């Protein structure tokens, strides 16, 4: 029966491949040839946020476009005011090995996690004045790779194990679990409407999940190695994935297949973080050679470079209003570019 | 009020400066091993669903934080990159011959990884007593898994522990040389491997780690001071 089931899976996968090939009447480049190029995109380092003692593993902008949280592997996550460079908060962490951090869309809480397998939720609006752990979500059997708030009470977290989970912060229990990946889930991206989210894992595949129902709607392949980063296109109908194979890839949810691949011959290093500009016309990707590349998302020609960092660029985020790009690195500096 | 904001920023910067001394003083170590390796016994030796366990100990008034991964999957290519700035990796191996090839492959992967390439490794060839017992038993043959052992002979300048049977010396130094060959095959001398023969009853493992970390710090300082 194992052979029969494998043959059935092969037949279904061939059917999916044939449907995708049929739907691929044209390539994105063939259609984007009609539009003029974005030109040279030169961005200057407006701010350099110093204060972290070790690598910055993650960062996240606040929805207000001013305050941003950054987590470092020295056991500290700092909430900065980017406009003035002041540090609003410096929360010490129970576990030094933090791999992710999130800022609540309401600005009231922050979240972090890492090799401790626990997602700590900190309340910034505490009456006592000093930020204290509001909750500690446990239940993952592997290191926490990413986490994102849906509201003040719900949070989606991807784990080193092959599953994601949507939690209820008030109760601290996994409201639902998302299974189907075969490797570590490395990245996570909430859709603009928060109804769906895409997760890229340590395999060729990235999966789309419906937070309500709790199953994988679609699986997209094409990458040759781990998907280290993932980000949703601003309109929510597509997403970009950066992988260890040194290439970015733009997939479309409706076409259910790869739409474009961004790569260059001399780029032989992995991609750590990707994000889209407000319009979506630019795709910014951080690399292991510690310089970010700004790609024309439509024409897929490198439009610019951000080469201010001295060690691996580990995190990269564009503001909600699109006024700046904050890049963190293993040199323990966050740089705002504009 | 911007003035209150700057005051809070100054307070936070003072806290960060205060804790920077603690961060710099402490030395961080990553304990790696397999199920058969007695890394847990090494942890318990030091008398001063969690994903990682930390042990604080002190030697000669310097503080060591040793981290041992707990509930993690076998695939380690991603969560190991977190330890690219530790002072050292204490690699514990079950030297009683067989999973020795597996341990050698793990050591090779650790050595040649792009992010651990500058991290020195303290190699504890643990469980030496079991190796001695089974080498003297004669039922198991190292040449079965490592045919080169059929030709290897202990170097003329060996330093066997007095009273040790030459067969045990040959086997232990053969395994040590197997690890050292991988260590020296690459790295261009920016990171070093420190092989040690340890046991479960040993009480000087902390001293070994302290001395090896002293040498690692000496090399770091010598490199930054342009002397190397």
């Amino acid at each position: 029966e194992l052979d029969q089931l494998r043959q059935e899976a092969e037949q279904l996968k061939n059917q999916i491949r044939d449907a995708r090939k049929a739907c691929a009447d044209a390539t994105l480049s063939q259609i984007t040839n009609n539009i003029d190029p974005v030109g040279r995109i030169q961005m200057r380092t407006r701010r350099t946020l110093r204060g972290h003692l070790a690598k910055i593993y993650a960062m996240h902008w606040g929805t207000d476009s001013r305050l941003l949280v950054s987590a470092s592997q020295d056991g500290k996550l700092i909430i900065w005011d980017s406009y003035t460079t002041n540090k609003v908060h410096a929360i010490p962490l129970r576990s030094s090995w933090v791999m992710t951090c999130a800022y609540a869309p309401s600005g009231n809480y922050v979240a972090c996690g890492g090799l401790d397998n626990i997602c700590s939720i900190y309340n910034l609006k505490t009456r006592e004045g000093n930020v204290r752990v509001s909750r500690e979500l446990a239940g993952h059997t592997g290191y926490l790779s990413c986490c994102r708030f849906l509201d003040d009470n719900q949070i989606v977290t991807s784990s080193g194990d092959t599953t994601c989970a949507l939690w209820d912060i008030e109760t601290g229990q996994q409201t639902t679990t998302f299974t189907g990946h075969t490797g570590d889930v490395m990245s996570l991206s909430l859709a603009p409407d928060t109804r769906l989210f895409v997760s890229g894992a340590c395999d060729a595949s990235a999966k789309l999940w419906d937070v309500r129902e709790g199953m994988c709607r679609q699986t997209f392949t094409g990458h040759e190695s781990d998907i280290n980063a993932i980000c949703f296109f601003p309109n929510g109908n597509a997403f970009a994935t950066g992988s260890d194979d040194a290439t970015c890839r733009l997939f479309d949810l409706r076409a259910d297949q790869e739409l474009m691949t961004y790569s260059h011959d001399n780029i032989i290093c992995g991609i750590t973080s990707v994000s889209f500009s407000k319009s979506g016309r630019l795709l910014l990707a951080g690399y292991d050679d510690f310089n970010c590349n700004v790609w024309d998302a439509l024409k897929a020609d490198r439009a610019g470079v951000l080469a201010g960092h001295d060690n691996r660029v580990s995190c990269l985020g564009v503001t909600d209003d699109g006024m700046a790009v904050a890049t963190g690195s293993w040199d323990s500096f966050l740089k705002i570019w504009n | 009020e911007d003035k209150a904001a700057v005051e809070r920023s100054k307070m936070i910067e003072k806290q960060l400066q205060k804790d920077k001394q603690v961060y710099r003083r402490t030395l961080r170590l990553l304990l790696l091993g397999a199920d058969n390796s007695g890394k847990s016994t090494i942890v318990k030796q030091m008398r001063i669903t969690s994903g990682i366990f930390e042990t604080k100990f002190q030697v000669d008034k310097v503080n060591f934080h040793m981290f041992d991964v707990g509930a993690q999957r076998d695939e380690r290519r991603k969560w190991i990159q977190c330890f690219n700035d530790v002072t050292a990796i204490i690699f514990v191996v079950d030297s009683s011959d067989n999973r020795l090839q597996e341990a050698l492959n793990d050591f090779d992967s650790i050595w040649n990884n792009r992010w651990l390439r500058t991290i020195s490794v303290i190699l504890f060839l643990n469980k030496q007593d079991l190796l001695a017992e089974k080498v003297l038993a004669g039922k198991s043959k190292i040449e079965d898994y490592f045919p080169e052992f059929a030709r290897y002979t202990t170097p003329e300048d060996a330093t066997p522990e007095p009273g040790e049977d030459p067969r045990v010396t040959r086997a232990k130094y053969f395994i040590r040389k197997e690890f050292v060959d991988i260590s020296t095959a690459s790295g261009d001398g920016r990171h070093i491997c420190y092989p040690h023969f340890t046991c479960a009853v040993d009480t000087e493992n902390a001293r070994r780690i302290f001395n090896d970390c002293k040498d690692i710090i000496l090399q770091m300082n010598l490199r930054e001071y342009n002397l190397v």
Partner: nanobody
Amino acid sequence: QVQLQESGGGLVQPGGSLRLSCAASGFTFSNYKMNWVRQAPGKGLEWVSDISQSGASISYTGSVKGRFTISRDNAKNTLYLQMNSLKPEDTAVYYCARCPAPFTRDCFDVTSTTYAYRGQGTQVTVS
């Protein structure tokens, strides 16, 4: 998708010789180091052989050194293991594993219980 299909292997008498072949698709075969691993009945996954991108450097587990020969064909995107003088211990399921990342010298997770870049394998049985 990244796929590896081991096209070879089967029953054999002790002391015989087989040739295992794996066809690799979905990725640039030349950029990745390749490895042969095997799982024997009642045992864990065991690393057998390794060959680099260009085939210049090769390595074997001591138990098979001198008996197995690993080779690579970038033009055909194929990995071969010519096995000679097969002992009864060689009976196992043989998988062709790929290095996790291209251009890298480390092969961390090829021998893991669950690995995303390993083929379904082929059974080799020795009478």
